C-alpha cells in the first residue's frame, strides 16, 4: 500500500505533506493576513493593499 502522497515529507521546510501543500497552494486567497509581523506598511510605496 503506497503512502508517499499523504505521509509527511522530511525534505521540505515545515513537515507539510504533499496533498495539504496542494490544497494550501490551491486556496492562496487568505494571503496570511493574520498580522504576520504587520506594522511594516509605514512607507506604502505600493497601493497599500
Amino acid at each position: 500500500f503506497n503512502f508517499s502522497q499523504i505521509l509527511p515529507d522530511p525534505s521540505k521546510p515545515s513537515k507539510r505533506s504533499f496533498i495539504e501543500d496542494l490544497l494550501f497552494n490551491k486556496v492562496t486567497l487568505a494571503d496570511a493576513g493574520f498580522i504576520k509581523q504587520y506594522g511594516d506598511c509605514l512607507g506604502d510605496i505600493a497601493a497599500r493593499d
Partner: protein, 49 residues
C-alpha cells in the same frame, strides 16, 4: 503737499481675486505631526513615497 494712495478692495467674495496662502513652512519626517499641505486638515506621520 502729501502723497496719498487709496486702497479700495470690494466685498462679497464672489470674484475671489487677490487672496494669499502665504506662511509656507518647513517639513518634518518620521514624526507625529499635523499637516496642512494645501489647506487639508489631518495628522499622522510623513515619509518618502
Amino acid at each position: 503737499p502729501y502723497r496719498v494712495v487709496v486702497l479700495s478692495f470690494e466685498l462679497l467674495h464672489a470674484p475671489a481675486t487677490v487672496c494669499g496662502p502665504k506662511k509656507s513652512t518647513n517639513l518634518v519626517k518620521n514624526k507625529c505631526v499635523n499637516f496642512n499641505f494645501n489647506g487639508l486638515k489631518g495628522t499622522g506621520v510623513l515619509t518618502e513615497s
